[PDB]
Write an enzyme that holds these catalytic residues in place. Sequence first.
Site, PDB file in Angstrom:
ATOM      1  N   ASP A 127       0.844  -1.190   0.000  1.00  0.00           N
ATOM      2  CA  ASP A 127       0.000   0.000   0.000  1.00  0.00           C
ATOM      3  C   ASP A 127       0.883   1.245   0.000  1.00  0.00           C
ATOM      4  O   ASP A 127       0.768   2.120   0.860  1.00  0.00           O
ATOM      5  CB  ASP A 127      -0.958  -0.005   1.191  1.00  0.00           C
ATOM      6  N   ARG A 131       0.340   8.914   1.828  1.00  0.00           N
ATOM      7  CA  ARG A 131      -0.198   8.825   3.181  1.00  0.00           C
ATOM      8  C   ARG A 131       0.643   7.934   4.085  1.00  0.00           C
ATOM      9  O   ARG A 131       0.515   8.021   5.311  1.00  0.00           O
ATOM     10  CB  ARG A 131      -1.630   8.293   3.142  1.00  0.00           C
ATOM     11  N   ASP A 145       4.992   1.742   7.264  1.00  0.00           N
ATOM     12  CA  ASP A 145       3.820   0.873   7.163  1.00  0.00           C
ATOM     13  C   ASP A 145       3.942  -0.146   6.034  1.00  0.00           C
ATOM     14  O   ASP A 145       2.932  -0.658   5.540  1.00  0.00           O
ATOM     15  CB  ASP A 145       2.537   1.695   7.000  1.00  0.00           C
TER      16      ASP A 145
HETATM   17  C1  LIG Z   1       0.892   9.858   7.993  1.00  0.00           C
HETATM   18  C2  LIG Z   1       2.062   9.623   7.091  1.00  0.00           C
HETATM   19  C3  LIG Z   1       0.926   9.807   9.309  1.00  0.00           C
HETATM   20  C4  LIG Z   1      -0.172   9.781  10.089  1.00  0.00           C
HETATM   21  O1  LIG Z   1      -1.249   9.402   9.645  1.00  0.00           O
HETATM   22  N1  LIG Z   1      -0.120  10.215  11.362  1.00  0.00           N
HETATM   23  C5  LIG Z   1      -1.274  10.150  12.277  1.00  0.00           C
HETATM   24  C6  LIG Z   1      -0.654  10.464  13.618  1.00  0.00           C
HETATM   25  C7  LIG Z   1       0.405  11.466  13.260  1.00  0.00           C
HETATM   26  C8  LIG Z   1       1.047  10.850  12.005  1.00  0.00           C
HETATM   27  C9  LIG Z   1       2.177   9.905  12.275  1.00  0.00           C
HETATM   28  N2  LIG Z   1       2.090   8.552  12.148  1.00  0.00           N
HETATM   29  C10 LIG Z   1       3.348   8.046  12.489  1.00  0.00           C
HETATM   30  C11 LIG Z   1       3.613   6.592  12.448  1.00  0.00           C
HETATM   31  C12 LIG Z   1       3.919   5.888  13.608  1.00  0.00           C
HETATM   32  C13 LIG Z   1       4.169   4.535  13.565  1.00  0.00           C
HETATM   33  C14 LIG Z   1       4.107   3.836  12.365  1.00  0.00           C
HETATM   34  C15 LIG Z   1       4.388   2.367  12.346  1.00  0.00           C
HETATM   35  O2  LIG Z   1       4.175   1.678  13.338  1.00  0.00           O
HETATM   36  N3  LIG Z   1       4.927   1.878  11.191  1.00  0.00           N
HETATM   37  C16 LIG Z   1       5.214   0.543  10.865  1.00  0.00           C
HETATM   38  C17 LIG Z   1       4.903  -0.551  11.674  1.00  0.00           C
HETATM   39  C18 LIG Z   1       5.242  -1.805  11.224  1.00  0.00           C
HETATM   40  C19 LIG Z   1       5.870  -1.950  10.005  1.00  0.00           C
HETATM   41  C20 LIG Z   1       6.136  -0.819   9.276  1.00  0.00           C
HETATM   42  N4  LIG Z   1       5.821   0.422   9.680  1.00  0.00           N
HETATM   43  C21 LIG Z   1       3.805   4.541  11.206  1.00  0.00           C
HETATM   44  C22 LIG Z   1       3.548   5.893  11.248  1.00  0.00           C
HETATM   45  C23 LIG Z   1       4.219   9.104  12.793  1.00  0.00           C
HETATM   46  C24 LIG Z   1       5.583   9.166  13.179  1.00  0.00           C
HETATM   47  N5  LIG Z   1       6.354   8.095  13.325  1.00  0.00           N
HETATM   48  N6  LIG Z   1       6.140  10.381  13.418  1.00  0.00           N
HETATM   49  C25 LIG Z   1       5.405  11.486  13.284  1.00  0.00           C
HETATM   50  C26 LIG Z   1       4.086  11.479  12.911  1.00  0.00           C
HETATM   51  N7  LIG Z   1       3.465  10.266  12.652  1.00  0.00           N
END
Ligand SMILES: */C(C)=C\C(=O)N1CCC[C@H]1c1nc(-c2ccc(C(=O)Nc3ccccn3)cc2)c2c(N)nccn12
Length: 271
Positions: A127, A131, A145
Site C-alpha cells: 500500500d 499517506r 507501514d
Molecule cells: C501519515 C504519514 C501519518 C499519520 O497518519 N499520522 C497520524 C498520527 C500522526 C502521524 C504519524 N504517524 C506516524 C507513524 C507511527 C508509527 C508507524 C508504524 O508503526 N509503522 C510501521 C509498523 C510496522 C511496520 C512498518 N511500519 C507509522 C507511522 C508518525 C511518526 N512516526 N512520526 C510522526 C508522525 N506520525
Amino acid sequence: MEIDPKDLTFLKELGTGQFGVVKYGKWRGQYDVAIRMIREGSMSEDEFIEEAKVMMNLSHEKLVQLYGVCTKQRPIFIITEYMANGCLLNYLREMRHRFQTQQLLEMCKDVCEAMEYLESKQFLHRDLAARNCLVNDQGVVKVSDFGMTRYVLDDEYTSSTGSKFPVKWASPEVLMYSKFSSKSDIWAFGVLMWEIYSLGKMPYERFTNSETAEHIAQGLRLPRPHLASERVYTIMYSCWHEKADERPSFKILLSNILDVMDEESHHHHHH
Ligand SMILES: */C(C)=C\C(=O)N1CCC[C@H]1c1nc(-c2ccc(C(=O)Nc3ccccn3)cc2)c2c(N)nccn12
Ligand SMILES: [Br-]
Ligand SMILES: [Br-]
Ligand SMILES: [Br-]
Ligand SMILES: [Br-]
C-alpha cells in the site's frame, strides 16, 4: 524488540492514523519516539506479532526505523522513530507556498531508495502512497507501514473489490487477480510520484473506484502534473505499463531518476 511500556512517556497527541492513535513521547527518557497504539479489533494480532519480527529485521536510512513493540498488554504499541515534519501529504500541501521543483525529484529518490531496499529483501509494501510516507526535520522522506495491510481484518480494506481498498494506487493485476509483487509496488510508486508533483493532490480525485478501474482497464493513466517535466513524466509513466514484466525494477527506476536529475540541470542546454 519487546519494549517495557513503563519505559515510555506520553507527551503529545499527534492524531490518529490508519492503524490507530499515535503519540509523541520519550523512550527510556532519552529518545524521541512515536508511539502507535493498534486499534482494538483491527488486526490479526497473532499473525502480525510474528510478522512484526520480520519487519524489525529491516533497516534502511530511508525506512522509518522501528524500535520495538509492546505486546504483553492491550492495546499493542509500536515504537518508531519520530518524524518531526509529519505525513508527506500534509507536508506537500504546505510546500505549495514555498518550494523548488528539484526538491520534488529528491523526494522521489528518497522513496525509491527505500523501495529498492525492500525489493532486494523480497518484502512487499502492498500500500505504497504519500499517506504512508513521513518527513523528518531535514525534509528527508521515509517510507513506513510496509506490509501492514497484510493482516488488516476488515475485508473492505484488503479485498481488491472492497470499498476501502486503495484502488487508485493499484495495478491492473492487483485489481483483477489480487496479484501483489514488487511490480505492483512499482505501479503505486508511480502514483506516489504523481502525488508529490501534484503537491498532495488526490489521484483520480473526481473518479469513483469503479470509474478508476475502467479508466485503467482502458489503458488510460494519470495526466502529467504541471510541475513535472516531460522527462520526469516518462519515469512515473514507465511505472504504469499494463504488464508487470514491462515495468522497471526499483533498482532501474532509481538509476533513471538520477539520470533525469542530470538532464534537468541541462534543461536549457539543447537546440
Ligand atoms: C501519515 C504519514 C501519518 C499519520 O497518519 N499520522 C497520524 C498520527 C500522526 C502521524 C504519524 N504517524 C506516524 C507513524 C507511527 C508509527 C508507524 C508504524 O508503526 N509503522 C510501521 C509498523 C510496522 C511496520 C512498518 N511500519 C507509522 C507511522 C508518525 C511518526 N512516526 N512520526 C510522526 C508522525 N506520525
Ligand atoms: Br499525551
Ligand atoms: Br532553486
Ligand atoms: Br499477473
Ligand atoms: Br485525474
